[PDB]
Write a protein that binds this ligand. Sequence first.
Ligand code: HEM
Length: 402
Amino acid sequence: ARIPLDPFVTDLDGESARLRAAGPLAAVELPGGVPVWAVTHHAEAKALLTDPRLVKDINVWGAWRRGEIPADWPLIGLANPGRSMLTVDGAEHRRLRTLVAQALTVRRVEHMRGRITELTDRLLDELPADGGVVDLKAAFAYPLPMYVVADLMGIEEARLPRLKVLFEKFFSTQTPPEEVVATLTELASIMTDTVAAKRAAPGDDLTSALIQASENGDHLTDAEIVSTLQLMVAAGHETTISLIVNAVVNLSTHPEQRALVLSGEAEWSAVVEETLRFSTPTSHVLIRFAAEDVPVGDRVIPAGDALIVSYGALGRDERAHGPTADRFDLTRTSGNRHISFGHGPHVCPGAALSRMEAGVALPALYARFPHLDLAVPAAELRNKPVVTQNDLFELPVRLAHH
Ligand code: HEM
């Protein structure tokens, strides 16, 4: 009855359906045969996300304290990440979130609109005009979040060419494991240089702001700042890309809704929010452990067991959005907002940033290429082999009728 999560993501929607069916708490198996629990219903997910009994501390994981976890387990990196706001809870977590929130603010994001608009137009200018097939992901969606975050972080523009090469290697599924590790260090090198540069000469960027953040004398250490910058790249690059990609796929497959937005009858923000609910870029999130036995519906998560949050599956929970939860409809009016950015203390601090990027990129893209459409059947689109993410291999499209 256990549900094996396909690492090659050959059937995301089918898997999500099975997960909801086996919800609220579904017994699942992670790539490599590692069993864990997964909350697959909206209501139950929010409850656990705010339950102090479910912590990030990997030490609470029974199978962990033992030898049930293969040292070569591919997903070990997501299960046991480096120190950051991601690996802690309670007071330690509140400290990091409050300090970071003084830097990555709503205001800072609003003030990035102009720059995001400029980068978007620059990337659109680079798109071919021949009328042939173009991979909108590689040529538009992928590079945007990279340049935006670099600008936000205050990374020296002369380092961009190298940053691009590093990003390519770091996120490429074909990069040798050892090379990925080496690349992460060079990225850390650029981040550290940035922190050193801003300490030497403060400016109006996110790094300078992270340096200056303070709580009655308390502040972020160089290590905490660097781990935060690294986490923002790890958590916000591919997600933002997929948000843009999935939005284009959804509009392409729902003509009447695309029309509503192009005519101005529907807002672009509705495209973004429905895309986050219906096709979130983050299908599953590792990982939490029960410090004590925790009741979930008719079942119970034994103390020491693991729990992943299946945002992809619960996004279409009919108990939260009614009968039409199984389809894309940006005109819906549910009594429950989606929780694709999480819920509770660990709620995504990049929600405003991603919404701003997609909110600028999508309108600009369609204003210039109003007739853009998929160059292949939607069914022919495929996911990248990353079990926790909903990223497409590519986005073949024809910008205009050739
Ligand atoms: C629309 C694209 C995005 C989605 C769907 C998304 C989703 C999420 C979710 C679901 C979580 C929490 C997982 C859990 O606790 O169960 C999270 C955490 C996080 N996200 Fe995002 N995210 C997106 C973009 C970004 C961006 C652009 C950034 C960079 C500022 C970012 C930075 C983070 C960080 C730092 C955390 C850790 C929060 C913590 O553990 O305290 N995210 N995100």
